[PDB]
Amino acid sequence: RHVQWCTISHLEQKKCNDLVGSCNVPDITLACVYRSSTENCMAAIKDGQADAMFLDSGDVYKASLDHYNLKPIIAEPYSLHRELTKCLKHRQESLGGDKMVKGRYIPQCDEKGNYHPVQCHASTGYCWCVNANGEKIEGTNTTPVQTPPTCPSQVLTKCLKERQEALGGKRIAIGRYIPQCDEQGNYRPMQCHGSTGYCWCVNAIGEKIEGTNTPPGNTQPTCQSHDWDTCHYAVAVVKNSSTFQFGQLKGKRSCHSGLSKTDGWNAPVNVFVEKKLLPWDGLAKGSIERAVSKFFSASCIPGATETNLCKQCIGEEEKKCKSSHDEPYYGDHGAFRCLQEDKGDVAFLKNTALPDEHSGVYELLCPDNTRKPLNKYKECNLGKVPADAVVTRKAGDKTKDINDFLLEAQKKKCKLFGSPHGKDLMFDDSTTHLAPLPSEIDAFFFLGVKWYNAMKALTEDVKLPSKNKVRWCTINKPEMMKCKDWAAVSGGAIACTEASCPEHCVKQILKGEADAVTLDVQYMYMALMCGLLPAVEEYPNKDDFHPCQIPGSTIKDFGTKRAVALVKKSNKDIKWNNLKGKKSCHTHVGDIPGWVIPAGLISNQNDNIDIESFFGESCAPGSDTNSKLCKLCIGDPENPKASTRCSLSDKEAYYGNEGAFRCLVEKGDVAFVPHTVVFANTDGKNPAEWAKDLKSEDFEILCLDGSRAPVTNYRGCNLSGLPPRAIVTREESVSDVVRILINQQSLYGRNGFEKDMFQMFSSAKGQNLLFNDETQCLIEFDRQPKDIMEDYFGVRYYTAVYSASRSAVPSELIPACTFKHCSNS
Ligand SMILES: NC(=O)OC[C@@H]1N=C(N)N2CCC(O)(O)[C@@]23N=C(N)N[C@@H]13
Numbered sequence: 001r002h003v004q005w006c007t008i009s010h011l012e013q014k015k016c017n018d019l020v021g022s023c024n025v026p027d028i029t030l031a032c033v034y035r036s037s038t039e040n041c042m043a044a045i046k047d048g049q050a051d052a053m054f055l056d057s058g059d060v061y062k063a064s065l066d067h068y069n070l071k072p073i074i075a076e077p078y079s080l081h082r083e084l085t086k087c088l089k090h091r092q093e094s095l096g097g098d099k100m101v102k103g104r105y106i107p108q109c110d111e112k113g114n115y116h117p118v119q120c121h122a123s124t125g126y127c128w129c130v131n132a133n134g135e136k137i138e139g140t141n142t143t144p145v146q147t148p149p150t151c152p153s154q155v156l157t158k159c160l161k162e163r164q165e166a167l168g169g170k171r172i173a174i175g176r177y178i179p180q181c182d183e184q185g186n187y188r189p190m191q192c193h194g195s196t197g198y199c200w201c202v203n204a205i206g207e208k209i210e211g212t213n214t215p216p217g218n219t220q221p222t223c224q225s226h227d228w229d230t231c232h233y234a235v236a237v238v239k240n241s242s243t244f245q246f247g248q249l250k251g252k253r254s255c256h257s258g259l260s261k262t263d264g265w266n267a268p269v270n271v272f273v274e275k276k277l278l279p280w281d282g283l284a285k286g287s288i289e290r291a292v293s294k295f296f297s298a299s300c301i302p303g304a305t306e307t308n309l310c311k312q313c314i315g316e317e318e319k320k321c322k323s324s325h326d327e328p329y330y331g332d333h334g335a336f337r338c339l340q341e342d343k344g345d346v347a348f349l350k351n352t353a354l355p356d357e358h359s360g361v362y363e364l365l366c367p368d369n370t371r372k373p374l375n376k377y378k379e380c381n382l383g384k385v386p387a388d389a390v391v392t393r394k395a396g397d398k399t400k401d402i403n404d405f406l407l408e409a410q411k412k413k414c415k416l417f418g419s420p421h422g423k424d425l426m427f428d429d430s431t432t433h434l435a436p437l438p439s440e441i442d443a444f445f446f447l448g449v450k451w452y453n454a455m456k457a458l459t460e461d462v463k464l465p466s467k468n469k470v471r472w473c474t475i476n477k478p479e480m481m482k483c484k485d486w487a488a489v490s491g492g493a494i495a496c497t498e499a500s501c502p503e504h505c506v507k508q509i510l511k512g513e514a515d516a517v518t519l520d521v522q523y524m525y526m527a528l529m530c531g532l533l534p535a536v537e538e539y540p541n542k543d544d545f546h547p548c549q550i551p552g553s554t555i556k557d558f559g560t561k562r563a564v565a566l567v568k569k570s571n572k573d574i575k576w577n578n579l580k581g582k583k584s585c586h587t588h589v590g591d592i593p594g595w596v597i598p599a600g601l602i603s604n605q606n607d608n609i610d611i612e613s614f615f616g617e618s619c620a621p622g623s624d625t626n627s628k629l630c631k632l633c634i635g636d637p638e639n640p641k642a643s644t645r646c647s648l649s650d651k652e653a654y655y656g657n658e659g660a661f662r663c664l665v666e667k668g669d670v671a672f673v674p675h676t677v678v679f680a681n682t683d684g685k686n687p688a689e690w691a692k693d694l695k696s697e698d699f700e701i702l703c704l705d706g707s708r709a710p711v712t713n714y715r716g717c718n719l720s721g722l723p724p725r726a727i728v729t730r731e732e733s734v735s736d737v738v739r740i741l742i743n744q745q746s747l748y749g750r751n752g753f754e755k756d757m758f759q760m761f762s763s764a765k766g767q768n769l770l771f772n773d774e775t776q777c778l779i780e781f782d783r784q785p786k787d788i789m790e791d792y793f794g795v796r797y798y799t800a801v802y803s804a805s806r807s808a809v810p811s812e813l814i815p816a817c818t819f820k821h822c823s824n825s
């Protein structure tokens with residue numbers, strides 16, 4: 001296997017060439033491909049001439065556009081603020097679950113708040129080993145009959161690991177730095193070198209604070225404790241021999257890391273525009289670069305075309321002003337060098353390129369027109385900037401090879417992150433670890449919506465869409481056509497977009513491409529984790545139309561289904577707590593009332609043991625035919641050769657709500673179904689023979705507390721009620737979407753004033769297009785002061801299906817859409 005790294009300069013090619021020699025990764029061979037600039041490497045990766053390079057966040061954005069179609073795959077992790085430990089968060093969530101779901105696992109945390117490596121389930125006596133994330137090591141379950149397993153100690157903290165590694169087996173790495181750790185195992189804020197006498201500050205994860213390095217014999221530095229803000233900061237660095245302030249920059253000479261860099265271009269320019277130091281607001285006044293050419297007298301801005309913006313660079317011949325180290329003033333350290341050599345009056349870079357030493361001739365130019373010392377960048381800066389990232393082709397044909405190589409090179413301690421030949425070659429010299437990004441991340445989710453739009457805003461006038469119009473997202477062609485019919489009558493309040501599926505609609509809404517979509521329950525966990533909110537919900541209750549006629553009035557019964565455990569009045573010995581091994585009937589695999597809710601509760605109370613093994617003989621269409629979940633099934637439509645048992649079809653006699661009812665009455669101890677199935681097929685409501693004369697009073701429903709009740713009390717004796725379907729949108733668009741939909745509904749709902757013009761809740765083009773056809777009306781979501789998960793799902797459903805946890809991953813989009821960002825206010 002090979003990885004071809006694209007380099008942008010001779011220095012970097014030489015360093016990459018050194019790694020080809022010095023770094024030995026079995027099975028994966030590195031190679032180095034030279035191009036003359038960041039942009040020529042981007043094109044090489046797009047063409048397959050190379051596979052990977054490291055890019056500044058600004059170029060990550062540029063590379064994500066159709067010209068190059070690259071995506072970020074690997075980056076250094078960062079932190080915004082101190083967080084609860086996972087174990088303590090987990091305890092809090094599980095303890096907040098529905099107390100009526102008894103016997104749930106509550107994690108055991110240690111005196112540092114981490115997971116004990118041995119975890120146990122009180123009500124079942126099972127124990128198992130966990131990793132530091134609290135995830136079970138599969139295959140370590142031991143039963144109460146046995147003693148608790150022996151589990152490897154948890155991995156050490158970075159500091160204690162780095163301490164042990166620095167000791168490297170010996171009694172002391174004599175003459176070498178050994179980190180000093182606190183009791184929680186984080187880095188002490190002040191670190192000192194035990195041989196040179198130098199001291200400096202680090203943040204809680206051990207990154208050095210620039211401007212704090214102090215030689216022995218000087219007053220100790222002042223170090224902040226509990227510093228978990230590890231985002232990088234754009235800064236303007238000046239010499240203390242000058243005296244102008246930030247607002248007096250017009251006409252000065254400047255050094256920038258580069259035209260396409262966030263710290264060298266986007267962050268300063270954004271501030272120039274907000275302060276009105278640049279006469280410029282939109283693409284009507286020209287290009288940003290041209291306006292910047294009028295602002296400064298002479299600069300070095302690698303990659304610029306305007307002449308005075310290259311005037312201060314010092315690259316030889318065609319190398320002058322290239323986005324490449326062949327230009328000595330390129331990049332963070334190049335712009336600092338340009339200040340240091342007095343080609344500029346100010347350099348624009350980020351805190352990680354500031355001098356380490358406290359004492360010296362440099363300080364920061366704050367945008368509030370004061371100056372502050374190097375180590376105050378957190379209060380003297382031009383904004384946090386995004387992380388930088390390794391990129392490859394969107395297709396991801398080499399992603400695994402690139403990740404594997406960098407993981408092994410780092411394990412082996414290869415010299416990735418420094419070099420004799422120069423600074424920031426291949427990777428930033430400040431980098432300490434590169435980790436894989438979420439598999440579905442793209443530039444939008446990596447940079448985050450604020451920096452993504454801010455960088456877009458410099459390249460084109462972004463016309464923000466009207467708050468008086470809802471762009472509805474459709475998932476198939478008939479929906480799109482119903483939506484074009486709505487738009488035609490809507491007077492412009494409705495417009496349409498198209499996507500392949502509900503999750504891509506969620507993505508469009510996150511990215512500002514659509515405004516609203518109706519979601520099945522099964523997509524709501526993903527949509528709420530990504531940060532959308534219910535705006536209105538589908539009210540399905542055919543009996544009481546009062547909530548629709550007089551909106552706002554309190555709702556007696558929302559009308560959603562209730563999942564119940566149905567058994568015969570005869571079978572008196574079956575309770576909830578003894579269903580194990582019995583014979584059960586399920587509408588079909590994947591049904592929420594017939595399967596998801598039952599499977600969730602069983603997993604919750606039996607250590608995630610397969611619902612397949614929990615029951616003896618059961619019928620659940622959609623399972624394997626040789627499995628015990630199909631043995632009770634029959635099929636026999638026309639009693640044909642291919643009776644299609646467990647068929648997910650009406651060819652299976654036991655499929656669906658009625659079908660699960662048959663399976664119970666004929667050969668079953670329990671059926672999992674909506675609370676309506678029994679009534680719908682007893683009291684002779686079903687003319688068929690098996691249901692004829694069945695009567696409702698002959699059955700009852702199991703309650704979670706072991707008791708029972710008659711089928712009529714499904715509201716107080718159910719496995720869980722389902723929440724209604726919801727129309728979701730962005731938080732800041734909820735009020736608009738509510739306002740527009742409730743107006744549309746006054747015209748085109750079931751009692752709409754113009755319901756002859758258009759009907760929201762039906763169509764000739766197909767069934768349940770945009771909304772479910774049985775919707776009575778849409779009702780504004782009355783947001784409560786609680787976790788939205790519990791607010792939207794209801795506590796019972798939340799804990800039964802998701803263990804009342806924010807950590808389930810039913811869609812691979814969740815890690816990408818919850819990725820945290822380095823954004824400003
Ligand atoms: N009557 C009624 O059932 O209203 C439903 C409405 N929307 C939900 N999905 N919910 C589930 C839980 C809940 O409290 O019923 C609720 N949460 C809020 N905020 N209002 C309710």
